[model samples]
Target: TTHTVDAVVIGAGFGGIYAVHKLHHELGLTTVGFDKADGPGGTWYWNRYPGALSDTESHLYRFSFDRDLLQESTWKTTYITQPEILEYLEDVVDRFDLRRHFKFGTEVTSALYLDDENLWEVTTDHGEVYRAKYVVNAVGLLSAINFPNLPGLDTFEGETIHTAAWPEGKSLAGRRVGVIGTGSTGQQVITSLAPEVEHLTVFVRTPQYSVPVGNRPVNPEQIAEIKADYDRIWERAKNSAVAFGFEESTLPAMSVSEEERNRIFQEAWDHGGGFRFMFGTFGDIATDEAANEAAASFIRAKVAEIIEDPETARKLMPKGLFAKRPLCDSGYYEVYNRPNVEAVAIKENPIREVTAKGVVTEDGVLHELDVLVFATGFDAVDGNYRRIEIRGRDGLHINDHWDGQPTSYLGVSTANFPNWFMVLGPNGPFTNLPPSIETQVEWISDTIGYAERNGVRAIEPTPEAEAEWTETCTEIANATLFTKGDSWIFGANIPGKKPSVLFYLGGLRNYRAVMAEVAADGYRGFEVKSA
Candidate 1:
């Protein structure tokens, strides 16, 4: 059976939920939402592992458009854990009465554009079909699960779990737990479980340069101040570079004397936040070599100071440039100092296979564990898009169009994909996500409204526009030291995935201006099919 709607929103996370509200309620378009999970919350729904928290502070990590929700909503701490964030999303859904529009526990299998009708046929794995004029692909930036296929994974006698799909009401207390991957999730899980688990074994493929999360209870006085100053805070964040509720420091690391630089770094370290330290401490840490080295060196020195064991400290020290997604944690390094914890630098001590009882390293030692945890992160942008068989214009498959490297115009719409707008799409702004999502979703909604008001049948970027946009993202990316590393920022973690600029390195402020200009210039560079 075929149902008809003006829009189909994929993934009922923050982006999709907002898409539903804007398109359906604000613009009076019939929008249907779909998600693989049986609920909203998108990434938050999946990432329910121990110690999961937003690296961005709680006040800055939320929607700013609705002033009422903004003023009324409250959080207990500086940082919000996964449970809190998930609950917040559910509250947003309930508060806006958006639960009725979503089809939970439904995975979109394919979205094919039928050119003759200029409509998208979005099909679900459960065999429901919807013909819609627009497809709001609000799939997350990092939703595609990238569980590594280590040999003998199936034979592991102990229970194996990925951090993304951690079972609810589950506890790993008094259990010998082994974890692989030392990214953000790995750091959080290790730190949280170290105190609880009988023994914790961490398989570190690559050491991360993490900072203290600086999470603490928000006092009533502080909350009152925040509420009073909410308007300026939201205004500043929307216009800022990384949008972590502070202006990125324009002062380069080299601009200051060594004594002053160390003092500044120490202050940001004390203030606590990975992004705050990166964007708030100095402007050039990501772009300039000397600046990046200066930051990385400080983290290395902190590792040495924090860890009592020299060998563990050396093994945990990150040698790479401090350019990946900045990570922060509560006692991640201190967790290693615990007597019950063991850190294995897998680059030197590679895992040969997983035995029924334990993991066998190249040194032939069987590291025993009753439960194995994979804190391995997801494939970055476009991973979820590739998972669905999305076909646009004739036989152009999304995978083929991306062709290892994804491209987009204004990071929302791509060439040949008529009326298919992506929220946090390829070449999008890399910032604290909620404001960015609001930016993209609002831009998409207005663009759809434009198409409808003009009676345009199909809307897509021209091939030339997409090429120019991709080139712009790549050129901007090359300027940063971030492109030099093998991190997921450039799709480097997934084996055989081509490294390309997945995000616009230009700050969110600039992205908003550029997107606005396009709209102001009569949707410049975008082509429309005849009604």
Candidate 2:
């Protein structure tokens, strides 16, 4: 089957949904969207594991473009669960009537840029073809699941579950569940399943620092206040660096006295929220060495205070900068106190192999399990793009062009890819995602409008622009403590993958201003050709 559209949007997640809506409604363009999932919701639809919830607050994690939708839709909790988010996305789709335009359960196998026509010829797994004037890749950063190649993984007779591809309606009420990994998802799963499961064993390679979620039920009065001040709240988010309602601290950590600093950290820790603790507590927590150490020390102290066992606390304590995508959890540290739960420092007692019964440690101890869960996170940022066979000018494979390090002009357009754009693409600002998504989507939409108005056939970032952007991303990353850790943010979590700065450490406010300036300067650094 062959079809043609003005734009082809890949992945019906937040980015794709908004992209299709903007192109069709705002620009009056025929746009088609595709997703591998059977429906909307994107990450929310897929990651339905126990205790799965967004780190971002429920109010700010949605589309701000629609005021009516914002006011009408309500969340019960400050932080939303997976089900609620999925339902919210469904509501958004229905509210805008966006479902008909998207072809769900259809994955785009390849996207080939037609140099002569300045268009993208996209093909799906089902042999459907689409020729589109513009191709917008909205494939999420954390969509691609990364499962480690463990010895004798296939020999395990018990049920194995990857958190990303969790089975629906599955219960582990009485099951002997063993979860591997200690990242955000792992922390959540461990915490949620600790009480439910008969016995829960957490196999940890590296310990993490997690703060309280401070999640609470939203009251009617609070909701009313938020609704009334919605406009101001969103404006503050747009103007702020991370796009959250909280204000980033301008005061240096060291500038304050030790007592004052401790008090501030304690207050933030009690208040909860990861970004709030990091950016809210002190300005240089992520940027300066001394500041980061201060924050890390406070967290370490908190971990010691929370966990009952000193040995376990020492094992769980995180060293280095507290910079790996700030984690917030509900009772993550306290869960270790449960008698039924056990924490295995996998680094000290490494997993020798996975037998049919359970995982055997290097010490020859068999940790038996009925259900094994792998909470190993995604190959973030560029993983989804790397999976699809995307070819640009002169059949230049995107993988080859990237050469393990993704290069983009303002994290939107690449040098050789004309009329192609990406939302929340690599090297974009590392902010609360919704605002970042909006900034990129709106900018791309306006760029397309510019091209249509000017009768431009092709648009691609110049090589010089891409180079400068890459350098800027690297410089900004180096300035911060983000580069000090082996987190997924730097592509270091995955084995054999080259570690590089994957996000623009520049503040969201600065990034928006830069993007606006570029657009105002007639889309500077972009080459637009009239065919």
Candidate 3:
């Protein structure tokens, strides 16, 4: 089967949804979207594990393009669960009538750029072909699941689950559950299952610094007030760095009095939200070493204060810069106090191998369990692109182009890939995602509109512009504490993957302004051709 369209979007996540709606409705272009999932809600659809929740507040992590949708849609909680988010996306699809343009349960197997026609020839696993003038890769950053190749994975008689592909209605009640990895996903699952499971053992590689999520049910009065001030709230978020309606502080950590600093930290801690504590309290926490130490010390003290066991508290203490993505949780620290819960430091007693019965530690201890769960995270940012077979001009495979490091001009378009765009591509701003998604989607849409208005056939970023942008991303990252850590944000979590700063350390407001200026300057970095 063959189909032709003006644009073809991959992945029906927030990015894909908006891209299709904008191209088809606003730009009046024939567009189609594809996703492997049977439904919408990209990350929300696959990550159905217990205790899965959004770090961003529910009200803010949404679309602000539609006035009616913003005013009409309401959430019951501050931080929403996966199911709720999935439902919200479904509602958006129905409200905008975007389902007709999308073909569900179809995975794009290959995307090849045709140099002669200046079109993208995309093939799907369903044996359908789409030749589109423009190809928008809306594949999400964290959509690729990373499962480790354990020796005895297939030999295990008991069931094993990865948090990203967790089965629905799977209960851990009265079951002995063993979890590996203590990253964000691991933390959430451990906290949620500790109380319900018969016994829970967590294999911790590196301890994470997590604060209380401070999630609560939304009241009618609160909703009414937010609805009235929706415009102002969104405006503030759009201009802010993280897009969470909180301003980053300019005050240095050491400048304030000891008492005043403690008071500020205490207030943020009590209120909850990791970004609020990290950026809202003191601005230099992510930049200066002394300031970062101050923040890290405070979090370490809190860990010591919360955990009843001194050994466990010490084991869980996070060292190095107060970098990594700030984590928020619901009783994540308090879960260690449960009598049935046990935390094993994997560094000290590393896993020898997985046996058919259970995981055997280097200390020769085999911890038996009814179920094994891998809360291990994903190969983020460029993982999804690497999975598919993508070729640009001269039959240049995206893998060979990127090699080990990924690069993009303003995290949207890359050189040699004419008429190709990505939402939240490599080296984009590190911030709350929805607003960032909107920024990229809108920019790409405008660029396409500009091309069409001028009778242009293809547009791609110049090599000079890509190199400059890559340098800028590195310089900005070097100025912050983000580059000092070995977190997945830098592509350090996966073994053999090159570690590089994957996000643009610059603020969201600045990125938006810079992009606007580029577009205004006749799309300065991009080379456009007329057919």
TM-score of candidate 2 against the unseen true structure: 0.98
Off by over 4 Å in 3: none
lDDT of 3 by residue, 120-207 (tens): 9999998899999999999998988888887677777788999988877888889988998888899899999998999998989889
In TM-score terms, candidate 3 sits at 0.98
lDDT of 1 by residue, 31-148 (tens): 9999989899988899888999998888888888898898888899999989899999999999999999999989999999997899999899899899999999999988888899
lDDT of 3: 0.89
Model 3 scores worst on lDDT over the 10 consecutive residues at 149-158
CA lDDT, every model vs. true structure: 0.91, 0.90, 0.89
* Colliding residue pairs in candidate 3: none
Clashing pairs in 1: none
Clashing residue pair totals per candidate (backbone < 3 A): 0, 0, 0
